[PDB]
Design a protein around this nucleic acid. Sequence first.
RNA 1: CGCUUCGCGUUACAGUUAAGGCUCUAGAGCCUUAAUUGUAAAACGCCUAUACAGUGAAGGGAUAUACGCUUGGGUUUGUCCAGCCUGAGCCUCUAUGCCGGCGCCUUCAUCGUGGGUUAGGACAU
Length: 433
Amino acid sequence: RELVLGIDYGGKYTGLAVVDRRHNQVLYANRLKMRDDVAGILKDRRKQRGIRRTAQTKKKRLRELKNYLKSIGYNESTATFETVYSLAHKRGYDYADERKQWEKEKQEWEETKRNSRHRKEVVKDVHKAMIEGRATEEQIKRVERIFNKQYRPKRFNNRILTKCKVEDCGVNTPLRKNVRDLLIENIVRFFPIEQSEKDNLKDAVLDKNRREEVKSFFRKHKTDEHIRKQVYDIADNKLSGRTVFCKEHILEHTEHSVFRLAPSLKTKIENVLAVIKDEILPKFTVNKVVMESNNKYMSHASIGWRYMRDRLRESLPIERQSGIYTAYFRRWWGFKKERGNTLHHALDAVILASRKGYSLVDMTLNPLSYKKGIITRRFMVTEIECGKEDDVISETYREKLKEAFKRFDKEAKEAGFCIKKNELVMSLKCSIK
RNA sequence: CGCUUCGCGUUACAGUUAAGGCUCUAGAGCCUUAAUUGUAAAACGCCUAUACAGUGAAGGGAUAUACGCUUGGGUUUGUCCAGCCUGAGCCUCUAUGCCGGCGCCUUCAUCGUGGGUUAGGACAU
Ligand SMILES: [Zn+2]
């Protein structure tokens, strides 16, 4: 009995099916929803880790400055100590601190810039502080090595690590800005020009400030706009992330032959395997046809596909059907493909595990306050949500808040809630229920 | 998946200022709410003492070194991991921070007591 389990893996939903290949009977067919909340949770972890390690570095800098200043005779009371210890909590940026994310971060930088200073300002301020406090010059020079000190090393050059795709080498892929010579040529191999012209284009695009010859060639030669964009991405050194798999396999990857993967992808695959282990109990599948996508003559094995095959063998022929046959037998057996349809995923899993014939008669079936016994935490006017405006303890600003959220239904500056030193939004105490 | 500060915000304490009042007899005190200044905390825990930071000097720095490879250790638990930190030869793969000046290797004095991780993915319960 050829019980073949077919798994169609989308970016969000996943279809599972088990098709007895005699008479193309279907013994199991199901859909499953994958966890899409893991990347945001990891982003929350990254933000929390950055906050905690910034606080820890602040503690280390404060302890070091306190120890040094008490060593050179500047006790806590010293008017020369309090000024320097006050500027230690606010040392400022040392000029060392897709479009939506850029726009978003750009605003917070300006937000930080509108209410902070440059390292040089806090430093010239500790200068004037210790130049009238009789600190000679060496001691002021030694507190500049505490203000302008990095405690945890900033190591970001070789962190995002990707292995190769061809599966017989899992070596470290280089960054896109290191193997540009192997990158640009990967474009020009599929070009209808002479090899000498290929080398001339290599020399022109590969920096050397010779983009005018690149533009002249591109005006002269008929070349696609996406290839135009890729070449100009190579030439302008705007490349980000690692290269598309290792150097010896950039130019040759037409032959076939995984502990590292995205943890969101890993937990999606494990959820699918959790459902698979609920298929495994009552069905012994002798073969597995899997096509893992987003939504022969195929491309290389996907990292999620490879991890899925390895974990399926751990929990056996596990093949990957081409998209041509699956797409053909799909619409030809009725209906078409819909992105985000769970039924479509289930029926693609049914088709994937089915024994194909040829010429339609086979496929059957933040801390809080605890004063006076009542909880009252402070929330900014931006952080106060509608419906819960009555929890504000401040009766002086309660009417003002509700009126602004009704009369006016930037708005805070219009409503006059930017009353601070740097015109920041004020915060009100709200009674937590 | 990740490094890193700049902040913002929260809580706790100690002050100051501005309103809106309760009590004593124009004044005094404290009640709330805003703003402002200063300090501290932001996991608990686990693991470091053979570890970690500072100080000054000789040493290497594209035939150093490691964020790179192999194998461990901490986090690490009921169990396995991810990430981060790190030991040890490793240099095959990964690559270079800054304008000799950063990191690194020992070394006295190290009096020091400091350091890493920290609620995320699965199974069982
Ligand atoms: Zn390769």
